[PDB]
Design a protein around this ligand. Structure first.
Ligand SMILES: NC(=O)c1cccnc1
Ligand SMILES: NC(=O)c1cccnc1
Lengths: 464, 458
């Protein structure tokens, strides 16, 4: 909200003093971003466009400088008032930087240049380092998009093995439940949008708002009516069956999908005791698909048990791949879901002869919150600075060979393989490779911009 | 920003469908929040005030309803357009709910009522569950405040054992470095403020902005200038000395290693620098950036002792002259305790060292850390209140609830509202009404929150 609308204070304190630490005669700087490794060997790049639209949404003003000067002096940090006033008076408050990035949605192996940031003004050379804090938080949507993309490859493998329509089923198989389990509204919106790079299903309404505001997508994803277990219990134990019947009355129509939550024990009770007969009849009669969500028991075992019991209650058809597809009902597991338990569910139910069509997964905190900057070892590093007119390589260690100088990313035309390279190598390899970065932002203006459908196309084409 | 400024869409999709799911005759609902366990046995309550000011900052409007109606229909959810229009037309867009909470900064054992949410209008009885999503995210400031408070008790223990001024040293002992390692600007601001419940030092400027806007505190915390990876061996590696010593020109923080202090002792380029450090007279804070966290702190201390000497304090522990060490890598409750155990066994006061945490403080927490839950405990149907619960025994909390504090001992317990009157001689109702029907009632400064947190002990 309004209280955070000062770019000059959107940084680590010690970076305010940073411009005093450069050698004399410095007049340019050059930084890049990469994943240095971590959980996965490749990352889906996403979220920079939102960060730039939201964190740099207007020119810097003299009022911003007044406010920052007062706060930083009371807080304990030096502040380059004169440098920022020059940016406001001479450059219209527009940040003198150029940002290039790989198109959002592309999946890039680790240890590769994902973005670069370069100063465009000799006197205000220090601006890139000032933005390190807000830019480096691109680790978050990158890492969430990556986790969701890795899960998609797992689900896709099993649908390719067991489903007659793998790519028609896939977009609905991982549903975001994480809005209550993430650390803030802004994180829900941006993290939720990172999941929508890969899937259509979300309960995180905030992600629809961000996709609509920042990625030109009015309705980025979908959901269905679903029961809350507490409101079921509030009918009392004697009318428990009537609460589920009300769910059908309100929402079960032909072509409609509605989700019901129940503990595992009560699902077994309804499939044995004869009060479930009325329930089975109205389910069949409605023409809807009813998704059952078990919310107790071992996350893996209970799915297989639901499939076996629902099979006994509703029957199945055998599809073209030889796998069973339940009639009328499906299962979603929203508990204990992370990439490892999800795979374990898929291995277990397909070994039992059930199509992956039968099952979907809800992920909450494990999707939006249980990630950190170390997950994909995200880093923003200075690789070159210009002193007295000469560019000099900057680096910590010489060998992982270490990236230095003014860098870019290349894509091999024949193989599609990515590699990092000096800007001077784009000319010499013009026949076999193309520069894979694009200029997304320069001197206060966003240049290349994506819709979410464009991002989704890049990510969907990538495979393991 | 402005694109998230519709409260009607600050919820889980399925909540749009939820009001149709209640039994006939329902006209009230009651919810409570608690920590069901997890890493720590007690939690510092913090952050609800910020959530309420930011997420419910204005009355709901007809434009809000138009927008939510269009989006939810296209998204796939039914929408209670008539119920929301009623709230706007009849109740001025003010949510008919009452929120009660333990005063922020209080530290409460797990499995206890920390806040309650109750409907105040028979027609709009379904509003509390609609807000569960944005209210349950209070898990985050609670959990960051708790991790920070737990660290504070460890440092307090060692300062009490080894320092002449424990409570004067303590507020500077854990510094927040997490702004680049947290998932968003909003999380930086609120998680950073949660740390400032317990300490004064932060590099997270966003936290100062939040404390100023939401907790009435203009300058909630402080820092000092420091050096970097980026620029001091960017001078060249032939002239790092005059690069690190170009900020002796302007307390300050310099980034070294433990071998670098040893070399500075051995060669003459350091024998002059010891002069310049004491000829400056400023306290130099050294942050190591490599090595095992426990070993590098002890080694830096012994080496700095050789270089600068010490004084022996009233408790018999050494306090270095001119220099201090802050360890900002690899810190958590476990390794922070190990550093303190090592240096105090080596005879050094806890005054000598401070700690930094980044993502380990602001990002490496989740809703499961303290098993945070928001639960419906009662509904009113056909004029009668009934208990709501899953499993009957832990005994299991149900009904309209509150939190009590024993007057003699200060110990907390959860209870039915029935029992505040019958135990009025021995106990006080420990919740306060913080919000009702669109108005924030009880409100805290950050200094008040700090007072509650500081008084609580293990
Ligand atoms: N739609 C759901 O069933 C849901 C959403 C968010 C969290 N938990 C469950
Ligand atoms: N795709 C699904 O099965 C589902 C289930 C429950 C809630 N949202 C989606």
């Amino acid at each position: 909200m309004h209280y955070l609308d000062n770019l000059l204070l959107n940084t680590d304190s010690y970076k305010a003093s940073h411009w005093l630490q450069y050698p004399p005669g410095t007049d340019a700087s050059f930084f890049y971003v990469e994943s240095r490794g971590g959980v996965y060997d490749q990352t889906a790049f996403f979220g920079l466009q939102s960060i730039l639209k939201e964190a740099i949404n207007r020119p810097v003003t003299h009022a911003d400088i007044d406010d920052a000067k007062a706060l930083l002096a009371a807080h304990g940090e030096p502040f380059n008032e004169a440098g920022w006033r020059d940016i406001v008076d001479r450059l219209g408050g527009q940040l003198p930087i150029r940002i290039r990035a790989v198109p959002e949605g592309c999946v890039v192996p680790t240890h590769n240049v994902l973005m670069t940031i370069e100063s465009t003004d000799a006197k205000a050379f220090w601006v890139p380092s000032y933005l390190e804090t807000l830019l480096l938080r691109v680790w978050y949507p990158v890492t969430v998009a990556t986790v969701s993309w890795q899960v998609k490859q797992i689900v896709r493998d099993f649908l390719q093995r067991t489903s007659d329509d793998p790519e028609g089923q896939l977009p609905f198989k991982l549903h975001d439940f994480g809005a209550r389990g993430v650390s803030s509204l802004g994180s829900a919106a941006l993290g939720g949008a990172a999941h929508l790079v890969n899937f259509l299903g979300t309960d995180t309404l905030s992600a629809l708002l961000l996709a609509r505001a920042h990625y030109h997508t009015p309705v980025a994803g979908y959901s269905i009516p679903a029961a809350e277990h507490s409101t079921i219990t509030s009918w009392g134990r004697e009318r428990e069956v009537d609460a589920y019947r009300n769910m059908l009355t309100q929402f079960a129509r032909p072509g409609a999908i509605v989700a019901v939550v129940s503990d595992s024990y009560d699902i077994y009770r309804a499939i044995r005791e004869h009060w479930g007969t009325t329930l089975r009849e109205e389910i069949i009669a409605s023409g809807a698909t009813v998704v059952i969500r078990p919310d107790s028991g071992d996350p893996v075992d209970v799915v297989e048990q639901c499939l076996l019991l629902l099979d006994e209650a509703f029957g199945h058809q055998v599809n073209g791949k030889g796998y069973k597809v339940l009639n009328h009902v499906r299962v979603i597991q929203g508990d204990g879901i992370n990439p490892q338990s999800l795979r374990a569910i898929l291995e277990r139910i397909t070994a039992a002869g059930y199509a992956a069509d039968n099952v979907a997964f809800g992920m909450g905190g494990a999707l939006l919150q249980k990630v950190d900057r170390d997950t994909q070892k995200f880093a923003l590093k200075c690789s070159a600075v210009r002193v007295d007119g000469a560019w000099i390589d900057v680096y910590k260690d010489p060998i992982t060979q270490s990236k230095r100088g003014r860098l870019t990313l290349l894509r091999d035309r024949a193989t599609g393989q990515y590699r990092s390279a000096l800007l001077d190598e784009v000319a010499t390899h013009a026949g076999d490779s193309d520069d894979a970065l694009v200029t997304v932002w320069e001197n206060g203006q966003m240049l290349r911009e994506w819709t979410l459908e464009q991002v989704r196309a890049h990510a969907d084409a990538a495979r393991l």
